[PDB]
Design a protein around this motif. Structure first.
Motif, mmCIF file in Angstrom:
data_model
loop_
_atom_site.group_PDB
_atom_site.id
_atom_site.type_symbol
_atom_site.label_atom_id
_atom_site.label_comp_id
_atom_site.label_asym_id
_atom_site.label_seq_id
_atom_site.Cartn_x
_atom_site.Cartn_y
_atom_site.Cartn_z
ATOM 1 N N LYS A 140 0.854 -1.174 0.000
ATOM 2 C CA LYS A 140 0.000 0.000 0.000
ATOM 3 C C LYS A 140 0.896 1.233 0.000
ATOM 4 N N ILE A 141 0.458 2.290 -0.686
ATOM 5 C CA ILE A 141 1.216 3.535 -0.798
ATOM 6 C C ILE A 141 0.529 4.656 -0.028
ATOM 7 N N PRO B 264 -0.224 8.364 0.837
ATOM 8 C CA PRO B 264 -0.087 9.638 0.112
ATOM 9 C C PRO B 264 0.614 10.696 0.957
ATOM 10 N N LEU B 265 1.643 11.309 0.376
ATOM 11 C CA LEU B 265 2.430 12.339 1.041
ATOM 12 C C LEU B 265 2.545 13.608 0.213
ATOM 13 N N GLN B 266 2.384 14.752 0.869
ATOM 14 C CA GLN B 266 2.480 16.050 0.214
ATOM 15 C C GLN B 266 3.933 16.501 0.023
ATOM 16 N N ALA B 267 4.100 17.730 -0.471
ATOM 17 C CA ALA B 267 5.420 18.311 -0.698
ATOM 18 C C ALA B 267 6.079 18.650 0.637
ATOM 19 N N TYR C 125 1.095 13.604 11.431
ATOM 20 C CA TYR C 125 -0.144 12.909 11.108
ATOM 21 C C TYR C 125 -0.069 11.481 11.637
ATOM 22 N N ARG D 294 -1.693 8.030 11.349
ATOM 23 C CA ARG D 294 -2.532 7.125 10.578
ATOM 24 C C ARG D 294 -2.306 5.699 11.060
#
Lengths: 553, 424, 431
Positions: free
Chosen positions: C95-96, C98-101, C123, C125
């Motif tokens: 599973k990937i 999601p990560l922001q800049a 964060y 999760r």
């Protein structure tokens, strides 16, 4: 005693039903400021969703035949400026019926002499008493207050003299001339701001009425030079120009002149009313018809690019007059021309200020149409009033210019005879005033409706606005068109050349009570404004003999 | 550090001479500068309920807060405050707050029974609705305030440690503290953007309370934080139920602009009220914008996977994971609100029944995908998260269609275990 | 302040192209880079139970955590994670996240019933063993994680704050907090100007906080070992307002005593496992403080309380400690261990089945060591100091032995004072 927010909510609940609970307002048509106050009141009653009924009344004797005969369940009567001087409760009997009464009028009187019964002893006359006058004859707290209730042979004898002491202070009072001290534009716009409704149309509307009194008094609107300034900045719509928006009605300020209606048109017929301005200096025709030809025909005035040159690049020439009259400032010093003024635009359709705009409303009210002729004369002025009230939409465009082209001949009509009565030399300074009787000339029809007559006087008070360092007294004119010598005679006010220090309101209405009290031999005061009465032909000559001795100034 | 005067949902001046003092669900208060003074104009959205009015500002107030009963003004330089009620029955009152050398008022607040005034030195002065003082407290310096009814919520920021928040209740007996300076997880920022940073050093755009009793904050990181279970310190945590970047990207088509920001106005149980501001500046100017509503979305996406599968559209299978996370948070908060505070509008039962039905339905989409990939063990854990008894019957039919007889008997063991616990 | 990816007992590359990903009591995970990719080989200490295996990496997984049931891999750049169970029952899953800049995964954790993934923005999760996503929680940025099959222990640090600790449990219905962001006074590393050319600069660049290793004890007590070389153990963790950190071991005093009073810096301590009495370590000899390829044999080092003087040990002379001086250190060591073992059995019960014999031997040595200090006070005629020592006895048989020491020292008034303590304890026992 009437806080401004309170009467609005109080008059809200009294008639807000969906039946014939009809409140009805009354207005005179004989005044421009009387109109514009009422128009803004109606439209908020539209968006507060109430049923209404608007009736104009032109005559003061007509008020009985329009109210006191047709009433069923009208609880809320409203009226605009009629009874500051004559008491209507003596004019119309209303018996006390049902302390928490059954039908309550208001009043929106704008005049200086008031009536003590109408504020003190108020039971149906709920007058507009808020922070208007805080000094409502502040000495009255013992005069009528001891007139209400009125060994004792030496005690009551003194008590009758105190009443007689109270009698004199009620004798000098109720014996003053009248004006309007504060316009009805000022009151209701302040009331709406206590409610807080933001529309520039209101801000366009309220400034119209106070602009109308610029030719009747001076320092009344000189108090309102701040109250024009703050509102156009507090109601700032935009910091940018934000150009090419056909809507949004942008408001600005630009300088402007006594030389009038220029931005609408005619630097041609300015030539007449430039000589009006030179009629304010020392002439009416002679030197100016040389003297104007240094300052004017410098440019021949074209046919096609004059749609552009005296519309646009007269800004090179308004600048040039702006750089002509700055060097006519320390040398000429005649300061009847440069003025701050106010303007508006419509996005397109030309720039129209409010100086010229009141001028179109006066003339369009004029033209635009036994005892059998006065009825068919009185039905006219109510009807032609009506086509001016709807002039405040965008929907009137090609009728807006109709008054404009009407106005620039009416002055050419009125100046055509003013130059006649000068050269006839029938003005006679007898002792006190000057008397002029226009017995007969050409075009007598435009002097039945009294709104032209004050303008004719407004031109005639300024022919005598030279130095005149004694006898600053206005005139009384005379004219007749119709049968039985109706003779709508009127008086004017003296004028100041921008130096009011002395209290000069009027002396004639005090004398107008006198001659009307003498013999009742066909004299009439049925017209509304006290500055105009009627006379008979064989009575005008004993009129003046009663006036040359009765010195009441 | 410089102590700048902060106001709720305020905008800076920029290159103009006018700005917004405060902004909330009731209305907005703005000021217009003229030649010699200031002019305060107060406009409302509900014109039919309250009367619009305006007045001249001679003293020059720069702080404002608006509630359902009045308007409070405050001067940071001279310490002069003024409270103006909307009704004509209550009279106005003016009192001067004492200020030391270099002390400036940074944040004000108003409730109908108490007045909260905070300063840069941490002086806590509280007044009632008539001006009578009650107590003077020395605490940490308050930089931001918000209040609904009784509660006082202050954000503290000192010179060395900083970044903390307090939560209290002004009861009739004594002031009770629920939280005593807990650390704030808001992210600090690492020309329109340059000028906004100086006036607002912490980047706090706006802050307000929700309609269901939970405190909300909206920092510079554009993430809507929800403080759930504030009555119990054992389970009090922040929940980021909305992500700005994901909502703009899905609705537009699959792109991401720069000039379209989301200013928060209010949150009333279904959507976040906002103003679509288009232009270079991040603060609105004067036209009248129409209020819009954005649907709430959990920020759980990949960026490379959305480009391969192609307003950007999200498929069925991917949206089932996001629907499960959104419904689980909202159902837990609505259950605890009704069992402790009761009903507020009268239609909470229909919202709760529709939310619980969509919760069990979205879990069955992930349950069907696990059976197709022959993962029997992952399907077993998904069956325990069901709430309704009718959802367990539907799970049997998905299992029989996928030809898994061992998975069918495992659903029935969960059914027998819940019936035994219900009879105890 | 730029962060760095943290792992348990991870070592940097140094002057080589190979390093260790993680290290614990189960085994060690190393990687070998040969010019294009990484080769992860996982070796264990118990060759009999599990089988050693290896595979090729095509994503460059640098974050790893090892427990008794599987191996978790994580990528700090793309956010791709992978869990590999050792037994053949459960299948692999990918599973990937999601990560922001800017946002990167700094620390990962794995328990057999919950999956914990922490980011640089804070964060939180959490996932289960089947992959069902839970609620997203936003907190402070996590820089260090440790767990032993049931709980979540997070360490928070930012640029405008300081080191803290949190203790929580991921239950079946909701998340329950034992400790919520309490301040941790652990000392930060003091990098000077002369450290820029030192050979140990590479270890602090991969780990700026200086956290060498951290793990939970065998009986459930939280432990941490920072850059200050002092082993800290958390006492009274069942009570949030009574939680205290107690230092029971220090490496800085043990190296000097074993080396015969020298000043060498080639001896260090690397913590691997601690089960209530001995910290397992590897004696690394050389300039580097981090291990490399092939590991030496593990040694045993018993815990000692850091209470000594330096000038007094040189005057009294492997450095040897006398009888009289060691009685004070034995009293401090036994008092801490007896209190923790008593609270563990009365709340959690037995874990191995032999806790009663350990508790009986510890309580006997506690009363015996106090009598050595009691005998020294009677010899110096300090009757008053001997009175306070009698109240610290637990067993009833220790009070009888105190009478015989007092009669031998010719103090009849001290004898009657011991009997008053005996009558007071019998009255309280009958209530």
């Amino acid at each position: 005693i009437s806080q401004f927010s309170e009467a609005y909510n109080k008059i809200l609940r009294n008639s807000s039903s969906h039946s014939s609970c009809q409140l009805v307002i009354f207005v005179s048509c004989l005044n421009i400021d009387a109109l514009c106050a009422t128009k803004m009141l109606s439209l908020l009653f539209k968006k507060q969703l109430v049923q209404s009924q608007i009736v104009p009344i032109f005559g003061y004797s007509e008020l009985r035949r329009h109210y006191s005969q047709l009433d069923d369940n009208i609880n809320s009567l409203l009226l605009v400026g009629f009874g500051g001087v004559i008491d209507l409760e003596a004019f119309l009997e209303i018996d006390p019926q049902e302390q928490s009464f059954r039908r309550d009028i208001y009043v929106l009187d704008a005049h200086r002499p008031w009536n003590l019964d109408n504020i003190f002893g108020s039971q149906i006359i709920q007058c507009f008493d808020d922070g208007t006058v805080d000094d409502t004859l502040g000495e009255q707290k013992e005069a009528y207050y001891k007139l209400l209730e009125l060994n004792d042979l030496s005690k009551r004898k003194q008590r009758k003299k105190q009443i007689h002491e109270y009698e004199g202070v009620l004798e000098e009072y109720y014996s003053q001339g009248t004006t309007v001290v504060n316009s009805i534009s000022a009151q209701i716009y302040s009331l709406l701001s206590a409610i807080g409704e933001t529309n520039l149309s209101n801000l366009w509307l309220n400034i119209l009425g106070t602009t109308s009194l610029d030719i009747a008094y001076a320092q009344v609107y000189n108090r309102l030079y701040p109250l024009l300034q703050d509102e156009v900045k507090r109601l700032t719509p935009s910091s940018r120009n934000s150009v090419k928006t056909p809507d949004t009605l942008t408001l600005n300020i630009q300088p402007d002149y006594y030389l009038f209606l220029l931005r609408h048109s005619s630097l041609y017929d300015s030539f007449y009313y430039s000589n009006y301005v030179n009629a304010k200096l020392s002439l009416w025709n002679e030197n100016g018809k040389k003297r104007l030809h240094k300052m004017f025909a410098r440019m021949g005035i074209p046919l096609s690019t004059a749609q552009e040159t005296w519309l646009y690049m007269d800004h090179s020439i308004k600048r040039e007059l702006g750089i002509i009259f700055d060097k006519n400032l320390d040398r000429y010093g005649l300061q009847d021309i440069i003025r701050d003024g106010f303007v508006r635009t419509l996005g397109y359709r030309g720039s129209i200020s409010a100086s010229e705009f009141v001028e179109a409303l006066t003339a369009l009210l004029e033209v635009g149409n036994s005892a059998q002729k006065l009825t068919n004369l009185r039905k006219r002025w109510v009807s032609n009033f009506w086509l001016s009230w709807d002039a405040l939409d965008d929907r009137k465009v090609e009728l807006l210019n109709r008054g404009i082209q009407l106005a620039q001949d009416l002055q050419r009509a009125i100046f055509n005879t003013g130059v006649a009565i000068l050269e006839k030399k029938l003005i006679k300074h007898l002792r006190i005033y000057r008397l002029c009787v226009l017995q007969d000339g050409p075009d007598l029809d435009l002097y039945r409706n009294p709104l032209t007559l004050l303008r004719l006087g407004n031109w005639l008070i300024e022919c005598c606005a030279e130095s005149e360092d004694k006898q600053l007294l206005p005139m009384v004119l005379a004219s007749i068109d119709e049968n039985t010598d109706t003779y709508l005679v009127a008086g004017l006010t003296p004028r100041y050349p921008r130096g009011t220090k002395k209290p000069i309101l009027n002396n004639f209405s005090m004398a107008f009570q006198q001659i009307t009290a003498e013999t009742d031999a066909k004299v009439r005061i049925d017209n509304f404004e006290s500055s105009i009465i009627e006379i008979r032909r064989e009575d005008l000559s004993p009129f003046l003999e009663k006036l040359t001795l009765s010195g009441l100034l | 550090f410089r102590y700048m005067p902060f106001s709720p949902a305020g905008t800076p001046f920029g290159f103009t001479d006018r700005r917004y003092l405060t902004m909330n669900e009731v209305g907005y208060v703005s000021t217009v500068k003229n030649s010699e003074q200031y002019s305060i104009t107060v406009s409302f959205f509900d014109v039919g309920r309250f009367r619009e009015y305006h007045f001249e500002d001679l003293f020059g107030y720069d702080l404002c807060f608006l509630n359902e009963k009045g308007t409070l003004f405050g001067q940071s330089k001279t310490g002069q405050i003024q409270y103006r009620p909307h009704d004509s029955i209550h009279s106005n009152w003016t009192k001067i707050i004492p200020l030391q050398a270099g002390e400036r008022i940074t944040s004000v607040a108003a409730t109908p029974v108490r007045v909260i005034v905070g300063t840069s030195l941490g002086y806590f002065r509280s007044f009632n609705q008539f001006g009578v003082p009650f107590a003077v407290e020395k605490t940490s310096p308050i930089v931001a305030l918000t209040a609904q009814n009784y509660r006082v919520f202050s954000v503290h920021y000192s010179q060395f440690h900083g970044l903390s928040y307090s939560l209290s209740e002004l009861g009739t007996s004594s002031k009770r503290y629920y939280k005593r300076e807990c650390p704030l997880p808001m992210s600090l920022p690492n020309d329109a953007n340059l000028d906004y940073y100086n006036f607002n050093p912490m980047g706090i755009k706006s802050l307000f309370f929700s309609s269901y009793g939970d405190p909300c904050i909206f920092g510079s990181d554009n993430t809507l934080l929800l403080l759930s279970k504030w009555r119990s310190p054992e389970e009090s945590k922040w929940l980021p139920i909305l992500d700005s970047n994901m909502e703009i990207w899905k609705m537009s088509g699959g792109k991401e602009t720069t000039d379209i920001h989301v200013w928060p106005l209010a949150l009333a149980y279904d959507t976040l009220n906002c103003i679509l501001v288009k232009g270079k500046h991040i603060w609105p100017e004067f036209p009248l914008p129409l209020p819009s509503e954005m649907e709430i979305r959990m920020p759980v996406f990949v960026k490379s996977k959305l480009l391969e599968e192609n307003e950007i559209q999200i498929p069925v299978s991917m949206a089932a994971e996001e629907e499960y996370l959104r419904s689980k948070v909202l159902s837990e908060l609505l259950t605890d609100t009704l069992e402790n505070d009761g009903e507020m509008y009268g239609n909470e039962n229909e919202v709760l029944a529709a939310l619980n039905g969509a919760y069990d339905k979205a879990l069955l989409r992930l349950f069907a995908s696990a059976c197709s990939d022959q993962n029997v063990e992952k399907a077993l854990s998904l069956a325990h998260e069901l709430k309704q008894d009718r959802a367990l019957t539907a799970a049997v039919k998905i299992s029989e269609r996928a030809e898994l007889p061992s998975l069918v008997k495992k659903i029935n063991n969960i059914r027998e275990a819940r019936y035994e616990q219900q009879l105890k």
